[PDB]
Amino acid sequence: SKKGVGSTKNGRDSHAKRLGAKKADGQMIRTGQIIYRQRGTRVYPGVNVGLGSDDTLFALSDGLVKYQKFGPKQGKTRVSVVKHKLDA
Amino acid sequence: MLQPKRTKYRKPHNVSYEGKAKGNSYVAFGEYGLVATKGNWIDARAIESARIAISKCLGKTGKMWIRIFPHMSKTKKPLEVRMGSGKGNPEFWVAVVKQGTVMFEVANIPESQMIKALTRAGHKLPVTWKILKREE
RNA sequence: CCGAUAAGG
RNA sequence: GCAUCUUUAGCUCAGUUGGUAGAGCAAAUGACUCUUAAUCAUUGGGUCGGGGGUUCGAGCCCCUCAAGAUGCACCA
RNA sequence: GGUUCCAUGGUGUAGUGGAUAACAUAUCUCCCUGUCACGGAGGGGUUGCGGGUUCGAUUCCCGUUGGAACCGCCA
RNA sequence: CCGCCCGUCAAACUAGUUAAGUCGUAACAAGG
RNA sequence: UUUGGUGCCCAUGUCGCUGUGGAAACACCUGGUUCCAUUUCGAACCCAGCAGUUAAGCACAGUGGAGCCGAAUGUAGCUGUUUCAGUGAGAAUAGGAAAGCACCAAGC
RNA sequence: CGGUCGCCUCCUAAAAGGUAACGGAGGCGUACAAAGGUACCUUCAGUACGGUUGGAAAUCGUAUGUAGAGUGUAAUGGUGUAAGGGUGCUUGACUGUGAGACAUACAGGUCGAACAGGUGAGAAAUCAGGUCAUAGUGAUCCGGUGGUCCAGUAUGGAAUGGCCAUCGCUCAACGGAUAAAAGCUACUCCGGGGAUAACAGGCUGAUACUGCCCAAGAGUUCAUAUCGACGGCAGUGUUUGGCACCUCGAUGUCGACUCAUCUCAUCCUCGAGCUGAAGCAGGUUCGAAGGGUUCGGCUGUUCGCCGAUUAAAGAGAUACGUGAGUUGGGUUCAAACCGUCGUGAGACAGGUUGGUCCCUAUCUAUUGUGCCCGUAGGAAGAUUGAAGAGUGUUGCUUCUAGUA
RNA sequence: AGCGAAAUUCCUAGUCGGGUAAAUUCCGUCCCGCUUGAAUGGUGUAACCAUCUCUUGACUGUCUCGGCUAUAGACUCGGUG
RNA sequence: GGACUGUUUAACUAAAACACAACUCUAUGCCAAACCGUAAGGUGAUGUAUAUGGGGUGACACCUGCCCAGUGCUGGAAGGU
RNA sequence: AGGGGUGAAAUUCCAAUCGAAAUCCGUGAUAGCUGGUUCUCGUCGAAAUAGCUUUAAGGCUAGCGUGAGAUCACAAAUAAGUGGAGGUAAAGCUACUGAAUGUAUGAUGGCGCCACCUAGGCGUACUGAAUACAAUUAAACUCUGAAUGCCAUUUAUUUUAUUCUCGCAGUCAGACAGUGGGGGAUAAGCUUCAUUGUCAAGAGGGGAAGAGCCCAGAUCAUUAAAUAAGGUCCCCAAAAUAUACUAAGUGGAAAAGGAUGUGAAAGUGCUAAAACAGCAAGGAUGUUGGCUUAGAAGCAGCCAUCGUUUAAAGAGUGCGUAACAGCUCACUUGUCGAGUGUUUUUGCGCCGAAGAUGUAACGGGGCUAAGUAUAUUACCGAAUUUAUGGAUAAGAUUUAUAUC
């Protein structure tokens, strides 16, 4: 005897968006490359770093990326692109 | 039968009883206590049996505290049912007892009755119990 | 249209 | 078998989900009438089936018995 | 064991696409009659429990009871 | 005639018998 | 060095309590006739002037009250190999703490 | 059969990203000419006090309060001078593009510096290629609409196409077979599968059965003579179950008959402890598997109820033992009818009548009986007995003694 | 209307009576007939059936319970195989 | 249970199944309806509604109740498509 | 006369065949499904994964293999150091959201008793807001918070490829073991994921026997040597010393629970001013207190749980008596002259422990060591390594066809 079985009601899931950090600290970067994909600003933008229509951080100039912790109780993260600054 | 009045989620993942003792490790309300030596899942039915045992073997002025509480529920699929078609329905509530958690404590009656009372409470529970006293 | 009227005296 | 329910004044049943019980009939009492019926008021009448346990407190919650009834096997 | 429907006054049933609940019987008061039935006038009485959404739930959503209607097969 | 009276249903005893049960009003007046 | 302005910082920078201060400046303040303004109010914003003013704000000294920060030891978890060597939290505690770093204008 | 089929959010997801299950919770197939863009101004909800209507809670004033407020929405993340609220002017909810990246099998998706044209806000710097962000969507083919600096089948047109923009699919089974499509087969057939079920085996032991631990109580009083709650720990594989490892180039599946064998958790017989054991007859526990453990009525039955006996009418295992030993009553072929379902062919662990059970034994196992050879010269007799096999049940009457 | 636990009844081995020492089958009756029922006909019906079902007399090896005898095999010898 | 005598699955089902005499409904006016073929031709029938074809029930006796909403069949004025 | 015939109807019969004859032809129908596919050697050598699929036993692309070419460093690996992202393990709940324990102050109601018909008041068997103290719980809680892992860079070393292009594939059924989880019941040799390994496609040695466990990676020959896991009484190659423990064949399978088994340790009480046990004596009075109970009065429930004498004595220690009573003990003293009593932490053992063919829960014989723990020096043990020789591939010196 099988006795019959009930039915499940929740078996739905969405595609996983590949968010997170893309360029790590110290890595050289050119303008227009993505540094951080997020839903809502988890990492604030600094100098030479822009914002998009999806809160995506992209570079604005050549240089080395660099994360600096700031904000109350050092709970806010900020990214920047320190220009090559070779300066001979 | 101790039972939470409401829960946000009917069917939670079971909580492991393997490990040392997180909280409820030292007698802090009474001065004699029933410590556990083997982590296990014990349900509200065993608590009520043990609590009723303590109360029947207590006196007219003894006072007791129950530390553990059956927060987590557990489910059980109905009999003769093949695997699939979702999780079963919640059946009984169990308190998670780890190795070293003081379950029951007693005070305000002589030592022999308290030792005897904790013994009858621990014979009602699956865990391997042990008597401990409160630090001065 | 128009039905009924408790028991023994 | 098993799981489930029921046992509540003389009878048929609500009790409420813990501060210890009423409803409708039956009985009686009056009132009422020549007297009754009927009516009307009023009214006494309980081991909450028996024990154990919880609780400060059990008709009320949990067990074991006693008597019946239910739903699941007189092996698909 | 699973699935669909229902729970509205004292009894039988409608409605409401959120802002509002009626019909009949029954009940009460008064005409009516020697009296009563029938008759006439007027009066009155309503969303199973919970929990969310909304400014607002009988209505919308998810659970919990009770009553039904369907199925539970092939070896 | 606010008289009389019939037949189902319900209860008991042995179709009958039963003080005050229920649904009608068939017959006795031109009984409508 | 002190006052005033401002950037960096984002409580060991706060909230509060007790006192002192103004020379220059900062401020309240004096009026709405001008530019400008109120979803209505010269309250605010904006004007043109410093009569009064140290309540405020502001600036200094004290205040361990609230808030914040938090050592060492030990412990829980981890990595290996052991059934012991590193890694080392959270909580708790002694305790610190009445901000700090630069630039500019004035008497110094 | 029921449920689901595309996209978005959280957890499982093990602190990069990714990661499944008929795992646990929810939503979407939009909304806004302002909820867009810009300039300026401005900052919670709640609570405390004080005040007509006015009430616990409408609005006002002051203070407190560090987000529990708002951010159209399901969640997550973000954001309290912000991305929240108000006002003025506007339409960048632009045209042609696009270096470089994210993520990806492809198709598609996401971010974007910067350039040219012409605008909006603003004194200017600057910002504006839709919204705080992630769901709000469908390929190709076919045909229709608007524009057009292209073609126009000898030439001029036209018809008909081309390019760009746009319209028609809960094509939702949502990478979409065709513009267009439901059922029965027990009258069946073919190719395969132990990739996958029904019988049995295997693993598990939820459930089932047996046992034990604590002692509340019941028991003329007394937990433990006999029971034993509320609880807990085991054993067996012994019911109902779970998995799908062996078998679909076939492992014959219920019951009955014949023959039985094994285990002990012992029904009788045998021995003993305790007793709420006077005697007789009992109750419970311990030891013990040598033997025995009946015949019938109804049902295919196992089971079960009933009748009469017995010392007793035990519980199980052995492919729920046993069809190359028997039977075929039952299940389950084709035939036929009843009830019910279906419009129907047909279907029902609903009911009933009828209905093909093959094999000469090669190996091994076993029951009997022989030949050869060995036992060291040969033969004829009589023995011991290592290792074994067979049987083992029990009742009634009398006496003891109507004695204890 | 008729019939009704039926070739139909799940619960159900329905209640009661009869048949037996004892009766899930049989006969009569009762009726909440889940889901009987009137030309896919309803209810009775003398005769008939290699039809189904139940009780019974005689009868018998069906059985308690097995035993004996005779043939053809099986078994031994010769031939085919 | 079938009224009966009969017929049936050659080679697993002989029956309650089929048939049967009987009842009823329906179509058919003769170049009849129905049927074989593509048609000729033919069966019906060298028959004529007391006749033929098809559907259902199945001796004999007593009965056959209500519903024309849906479907099927027949007829119908006009009207709409 | 066959998408036809016949059928008193069963899917009947139509040449031993009928859900639609037999035979030939289209035809070598089609089959994502079974089965089979034939000589040798050498080099290298997978996958059982993702997405889509009327797709799930199939197919395409990506991932993994192989052949050729390019890239020398900026490419890719192995170690050390540094920087960064994160929110898991843990921990915490006065840092939120839920759940939640006790104490104290207590809104609130229930419950009363009054007054008053509406404004209310005094206590609440009790419910319980908020606050303080102490303590808790969480995958979808976080004021915090690692390690590992991930990305990038620096240094050292190594390889021309794990990078790019082209040709040819196979693979889309996986299994088990350790670790972190989901479903299941903290069941499954269960199912679904992440990661480390083995098998698949891998022999050898250990595990008695075993695909997945441990040691490792087989070119061929050698009757050479050293070793890994594992082991050294015999089967079966190889051991001895020394120190303790076990008495159970424990070893050589098990839980809750129970026990004067034994060894070690750390404390505490008395003792030759006499210890403990036993023996010999006493072991009391009011009184038999009093309610209470038929009665209790040393031993029913009570009112409690008395006091003196005295060495000691209890409203008694039980038995027991209707109850007293009575026997008798807790307590004190004496013969007595060497050990006793208790607490805690540990090592090895006992019981709990019943299944079905035959010892059958060490592999067997056997073992009080041939069992357990420790220390020292040895040995055995693989197809591992070394040594001798034969064969062969690719790289170098170099061209004898020589050495690495």
Ligand SMILES: *C(=O)[C@@H](N)CCCC[NH3+]
């Ligand atoms: C049919 O119902 C079988 N599955 C039940 C067998 C029960 C045996 N105790």
Ligand SMILES: [K+]
């Ligand atoms: K098979």
Ligand SMILES: [Mg+2]
């Ligand atoms: Mg996601």
Ligand SMILES: [Mg+2]
């Ligand atoms: Mg009078």
Ligand SMILES: [Mg+2]
């Ligand atoms: Mg069937």
Ligand SMILES: [Mg+2]
């Ligand atoms: Mg001042």
Ligand SMILES: [Mg+2]
């Ligand atoms: Mg379906």
Ligand SMILES: [Mg+2]
């Ligand atoms: Mg992650």
Ligand SMILES: [Mg+2]
């Ligand atoms: Mg990770």
Ligand SMILES: [Mg+2]
């Ligand atoms: Mg939201």
Ligand SMILES: [Mg+2]
């Ligand atoms: Mg605006």
Ligand SMILES: [Mg+2]
């Ligand atoms: Mg906006």
Ligand SMILES: [Mg+2]
């Ligand atoms: Mg088309």
Ligand SMILES: [Mg+2]
């Ligand atoms: Mg032309």
Ligand SMILES: [Mg+2]
């Ligand atoms: Mg699809």
Ligand SMILES: [Mg+2]
């Ligand atoms: Mg897609």
